[PDB]
């Protein structure tokens with residue numbers, strides 16, 4: 001249905017560059033229904049981190065959906081709203097003294113990532129979080145309201161969700177990872193591995209080894225939201241790349257994708273300081 005915002009990200013024939021890349025049939029979250037991967041997609045995904053002798057994926061996903069919800073709506077019930085407005089907050093130190101907190105919090109969803117804190121940074125980054133993307137090597141404890149979106153880069157990452165909410169047996173991947181987390185099982189969502197390959201193939205055109213968490217978060221919000229505003233992406237005005245509180249990816253090519261999306265009004269970018 002056409003959205004009721006000023007513009008709608010889904011709208012075709014605004015930009016053929018967007019229409020070529022956006023695929024409305026993509027499902028960005030894993031469910032029991034959608035979890036079968038095509039062989040080529042599965043082989044691509046195993047190659048990202050090259051784990052030795054991974055456990056069978058369908059067995060892992062079965063066990064995963066004994067623990068966390070296995071029948072989420074893949075677009076997080078976007079069907080029940082007419083205009084969903086989202087803020088996607090990256091980690092750039094361009095948010096320092098930006099005073100973007102209130103405008104960030106004014107959105108329906110606020111999506112954060114990795115170990116980025118809000119505590120003590122609220123005036124700049126906001127206090128609201130509806131969804132927060134993590135992987136085992138870049139988790140921090142989340143407030144209890146917050147949906148955790150696990151972005152899996154290897155079979156162990158799904159195993160880790162199982163373990164860290166239950167037995168606490170996985171404490172190491174390529175680095176130490178938390179053996180337990182406090183996040184409630186009902187608040188966990190799983191980014192679909194096929195949607196990672198869609199991001200890589202169609203949005204990044206095969207640039208990088210695989211997509212960064214920032215660009216995965218952006219394309220995910222193109223699908224789940226009608227209006228998307230980006231904060232904390234890019235360097236600051238002095239050209240520094242640092243975090244606001246403290247190769248594998250092609251950051252130039254990903255940056256250019258977000259610049260082009262902004263130019264066609266499919267997102268807005270707040271550049272900060």
Ligand SMILES: CC(=O)N[C@H]1[C@@H](Oc2ccccc2[N+](=O)O)O[C@H](CO)[C@H](O)[C@@H]1O[C@@H]1O[C@H](CO)[C@H](O)[C@H](O)[C@H]1O
Nearest residue numbers: 048049050135136137153174175211212213247248249
């Ligand atoms: C910097 C880099 O290439 N990181 C890769 C690498 O990481 C390591 C491997 C072995 C020991 C230490 C590290 N490490 O702490 O940097 O290889 C792993 C796979 O074994 C990852 O691909 C690292 O890349 C990170 O992956 C995460 C997702 O796990 C995320 O994409 C980060 O953006 C990326 O740097």
Ligand SMILES: Nc1ccn([C@@H]2O[C@H](COP(=O)(O)O)[C@@H](O)[C@H]2O)c(=O)n1
Nearest residue numbers: 090091092114212213214233234241242
């Ligand atoms: N200086 C920065 C810092 C982070 N970022 C974005 O925020 C996302 C998460 O940052 P971290 O991986 O450093 O936690 C990155 O993958 C990137 O797209 C950015 O675009 N500019």
